[PDB]
Design a protein around this nucleic acid. Sequence first.
RNA 1: UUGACUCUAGUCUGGCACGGUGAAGAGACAUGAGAAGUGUAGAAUAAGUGGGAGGCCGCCGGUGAAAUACCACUACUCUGAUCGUUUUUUCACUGACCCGGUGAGGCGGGGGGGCGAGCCGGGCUCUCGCUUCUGGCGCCAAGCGCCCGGCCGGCCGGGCGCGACCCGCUCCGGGGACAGUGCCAGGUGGGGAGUUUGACUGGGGCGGUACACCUGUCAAACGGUAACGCAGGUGUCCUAAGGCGA
RNA 2: GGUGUUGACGCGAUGUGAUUUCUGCCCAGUGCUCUGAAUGUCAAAGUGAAGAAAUUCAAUGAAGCGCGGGUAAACGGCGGGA
RNA 3: CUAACACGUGCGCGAGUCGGGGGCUACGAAAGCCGCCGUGGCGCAAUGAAGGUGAAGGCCGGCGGCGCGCCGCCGGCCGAG
RNA 4: GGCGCGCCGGGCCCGGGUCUUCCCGGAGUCGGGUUGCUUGGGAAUGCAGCCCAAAGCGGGUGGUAAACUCCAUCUAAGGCU
RNA 5: CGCGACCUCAGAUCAGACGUGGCGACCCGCUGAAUUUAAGCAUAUUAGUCAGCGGAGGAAAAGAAACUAACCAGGAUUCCCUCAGUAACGGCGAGUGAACAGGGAAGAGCCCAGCGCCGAAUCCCCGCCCCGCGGCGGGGCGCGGGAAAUGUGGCGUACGGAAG
RNA 6: GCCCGGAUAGCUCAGCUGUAGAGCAUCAGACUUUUAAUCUGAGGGUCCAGGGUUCAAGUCCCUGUUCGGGCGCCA
Lengths: 51, 206
Amino acid sequence: YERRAMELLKVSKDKRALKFIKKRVGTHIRAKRKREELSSVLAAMRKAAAK
Amino acid sequence: VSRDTLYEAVREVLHGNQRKRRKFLETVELQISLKNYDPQKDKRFSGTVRLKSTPRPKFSVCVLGDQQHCDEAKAVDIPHMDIEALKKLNKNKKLVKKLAKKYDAFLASESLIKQIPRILGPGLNKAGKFPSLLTHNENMVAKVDEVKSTIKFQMKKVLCLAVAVGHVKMTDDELVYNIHLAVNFLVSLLKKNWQNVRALYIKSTM
RNA sequence: UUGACUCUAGUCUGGCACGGUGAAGAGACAUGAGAAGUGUAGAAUAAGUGGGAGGCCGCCGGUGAAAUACCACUACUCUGAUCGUUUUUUCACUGACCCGGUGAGGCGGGGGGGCGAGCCGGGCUCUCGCUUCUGGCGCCAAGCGCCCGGCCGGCCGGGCGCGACCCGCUCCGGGGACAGUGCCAGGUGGGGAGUUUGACUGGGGCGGUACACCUGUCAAACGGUAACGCAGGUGUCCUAAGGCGA
RNA sequence: GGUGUUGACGCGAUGUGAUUUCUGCCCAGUGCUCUGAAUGUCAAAGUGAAGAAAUUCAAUGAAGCGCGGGUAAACGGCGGGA
RNA sequence: CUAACACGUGCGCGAGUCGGGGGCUACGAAAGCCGCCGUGGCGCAAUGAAGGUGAAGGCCGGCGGCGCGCCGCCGGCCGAG
RNA sequence: GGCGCGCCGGGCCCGGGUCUUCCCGGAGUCGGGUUGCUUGGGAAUGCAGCCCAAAGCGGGUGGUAAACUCCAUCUAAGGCU
RNA sequence: CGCGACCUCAGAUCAGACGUGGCGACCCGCUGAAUUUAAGCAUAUUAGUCAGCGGAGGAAAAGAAACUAACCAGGAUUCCCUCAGUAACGGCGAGUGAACAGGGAAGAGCCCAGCGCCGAAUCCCCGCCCCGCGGCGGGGCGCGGGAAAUGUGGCGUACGGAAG
RNA sequence: GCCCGGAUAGCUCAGCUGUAGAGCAUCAGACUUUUAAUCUGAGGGUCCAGGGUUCAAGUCCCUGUUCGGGCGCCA
Ligand SMILES: [Mg+2]
Ligand SMILES: [Mg+2]
Ligand SMILES: [Mg+2]
Ligand SMILES: [Mg+2]
Ligand SMILES: [Mg+2]
Ligand SMILES: [Mg+2]
Ligand SMILES: [Mg+2]
Ligand SMILES: [Mg+2]
Ligand SMILES: [Mg+2]
Ligand SMILES: [Mg+2]
Ligand SMILES: [Mg+2]
Ligand SMILES: [Mg+2]
Ligand SMILES: [Mg+2]
Ligand SMILES: [Mg+2]
Ligand SMILES: [Mg+2]
Ligand SMILES: [Mg+2]
Ligand SMILES: [Mg+2]
Ligand SMILES: [Mg+2]
Ligand SMILES: [Mg+2]
Ligand SMILES: [Mg+2]
Ligand SMILES: [Mg+2]
Ligand SMILES: [Mg+2]
Ligand SMILES: [Mg+2]
Ligand SMILES: [Mg+2]
Ligand SMILES: [Mg+2]
Ligand SMILES: [Mg+2]
Ligand SMILES: [Mg+2]
Ligand SMILES: [Mg+2]
Ligand SMILES: [Mg+2]
Ligand SMILES: [Mg+2]
Ligand SMILES: [Mg+2]
Ligand SMILES: [Mg+2]
Ligand SMILES: [Mg+2]
Ligand SMILES: [Mg+2]
Ligand SMILES: [Mg+2]
């Protein structure tokens, strides 16, 4: 589920990625926290591909 | 974003001056890319920031002043524009929009912005280079320095910006604090925070 | 009992999970690579923003414009295609799972061998691998080869291998990510459950409403006064058929 | 788990009641069954949009109703006036 | 018979009242005592859905205000129909 | 029987304050959806089945669903008395 | 092919032990109705009650906060008075219905896993010697056998703790 | 009420930065016996109203009536 959310965050659909994590985890607070740590993971992957 | 990214990217751009060892007056720039901000609808933003670091310094100054400005302006190399010269450059707005293309930004006197919106106010407000109003210190030293580097974060209809911050010779933790001022005022200027910025770039003129 | 009310085991259908492995077909996308960016004025095919004063041997001006020209490192749209993310349809695979058979007894390859094909004793492809006149018998190894021990070349008892090929990863077959089960949702459901099936009344039923109201009467000159007494009316209609004034 | 130590000359579910002689007409109704493809209706789950979110709205649309063939040795039925 | 409520009546105290629960000291598992054990109940205050608010007034002197003779505010007096 | 006391054999060779550096937590569980039961618990108090199923300035609670933002309070999914 | 480790798994009339069953007033877990009330009845009520089933003890269970609160804050559990027939639930009908706070009875706190650091520093069992033995225990010796590194013991547990 | 669609000369439609175009109808001329039919052409919009981005918007984004369409209510 968090791989599919990382695909949505890679295509940068933050609202549907948040609704997806909000369904498949629970509360909106846990949704926001997991969306932002997946954004940090995906940014680290972009920097790893950069240099 | 964390600060260590700024640290390693900026030390890498100091010893990545090795790319060209440039020929020019070296200075670097920030670049902005926004996530999903609507450029067309309302609450489009235009925020100027009082940056106290002045990253330009090859910078061009020509002002408009009252009296008591004459001796101090011609002393410390500041162009005192009188009202006769205001009317002179009002006689043909082609020459002062050359002058708007000559120098960077202007400074405004206290009262003569009824004399400005006669025809030259609407004439050269169509350049984005409006003069900056004085204060009743009446001391232009460091007031022009706190007029320069008041950076216009601007929302035009394209989802891209770029901010001229950083030159290669300044102090270095002060550079990362300069760029930290730039990015936190940008993100706090936006209607939504760090999710609203896709990719912030800091790469140089080349 | 059912066309009563409210439900119910069962069954039908959909979704989720167990629940995988591929190959094609149709897409949506992401990404790399490539050209587009023709209202004008302007030497001009200016999409846009932001820096920029000499890369490399056009430009800073100035010209017209709203906005300008090296570089880059960006963000938008458009048009063909490589590549990896998901959905979907079809064809397959076996590994979860189901079924059948058995004393789970020769399965799949490869080798060795016998009948056919034609090309010059040869290889390949393919097939076969020993039982059909009889209400008989059929096991517990003959034969070959190699080691071995007890007694004096002779005697007695041994062990191993070919006979009975080798190698393997599901015992063989049939299905197969659908049957199926677990949980929801919708349909159906007198098979079964629980209950109900007004009142008044010259018995009850059928009829009627005398059950809520209205006029005359009854009603005996205040008011009140009964029956399934009498003759009738109502569940409406009106933007004027309300309110004034003439 | 029974039928089943069974396999359509069988198991199961009905009607009528030997033999002879027949078994007429009706598919409108109520059933049963067959087919999924016009307009309909139709659940949760899934999809898209709006919004700060709960939530709202739209689209798609399984069986069943609907609609349509078949069937009376299925339940039943099978006139009048000059 | 237990519980609850209502009214009447007897008794003690009375804007109070009650130790019923706990504790301290044969009949006696009674009886007495607590009081800085009144926690608490009921009463002493009503009303409103709620925020909430929460149960006499008058006279004197001073300081139309204008086409607060009413009186706003200050000191005294009478003071509870 | 226990409270008193002696003698031998054996166990332990234990503590407190300050400073410096370290280290620290319970997962098909919490939580969410839905369904059924239970509760005074009311946009769901508790329990359970199915599906989803985490986090670490985290997580639960803060009696009206939800977003934002401060606070307050505990430390679940291990155990004895 | 044989030998040897380990792992998964069998057979013992193997050595030593342990559970079964009963009573069941009180207690814990599950299941759990309908009479009855609603002047009928279907939600509710009876009622988490009777019946059923499992399991204990001298008491059981609970219990040292993922608590109550919203104050100047209290502080495990259990019981009593009160809160209160209140807040609340309910064809808001009949009926149902807690807790906080306060006063009392009593009063007690603690231990792991993890994070660690100590040569597994740990535990069981067999044989002999001495003692005691009708709650098989204390001391010594075994080049006696096992368990355990897939983790025993010592310090340490949110009230912080460890090392120097 | 609701995303949604729409406004363009008297009437139907075309149309990213300006001569608002294609027709239908009118006006007047030529033809004809006569505007009866033809034909030549002209006249005719404050683009529904307003604000905003833009170099300027009838075109993009908002706001405001007004209508066309299925749901929402009602049995
Ligand atoms: Mg019915
Ligand atoms: Mg039925
Ligand atoms: Mg019945
Ligand atoms: Mg009757
Ligand atoms: Mg009379
Ligand atoms: Mg028949
Ligand atoms: Mg017949
Ligand atoms: Mg029919
Ligand atoms: Mg009949
Ligand atoms: Mg009475
Ligand atoms: Mg009395
Ligand atoms: Mg129950
Ligand atoms: Mg229960
Ligand atoms: Mg109940
Ligand atoms: Mg604990
Ligand atoms: Mg605990
Ligand atoms: Mg316990
Ligand atoms: Mg034994
Ligand atoms: Mg009754
Ligand atoms: Mg009765
Ligand atoms: Mg009855
Ligand atoms: Mg009950
Ligand atoms: Mg019982
Ligand atoms: Mg027992
Ligand atoms: Mg006992
Ligand atoms: Mg106990
Ligand atoms: Mg408590
Ligand atoms: Mg009371
Ligand atoms: Mg009622
Ligand atoms: Mg009850
Ligand atoms: Mg209490
Ligand atoms: Mg005490
Ligand atoms: Mg310990
Ligand atoms: Mg340990
Ligand atoms: Mg604790």
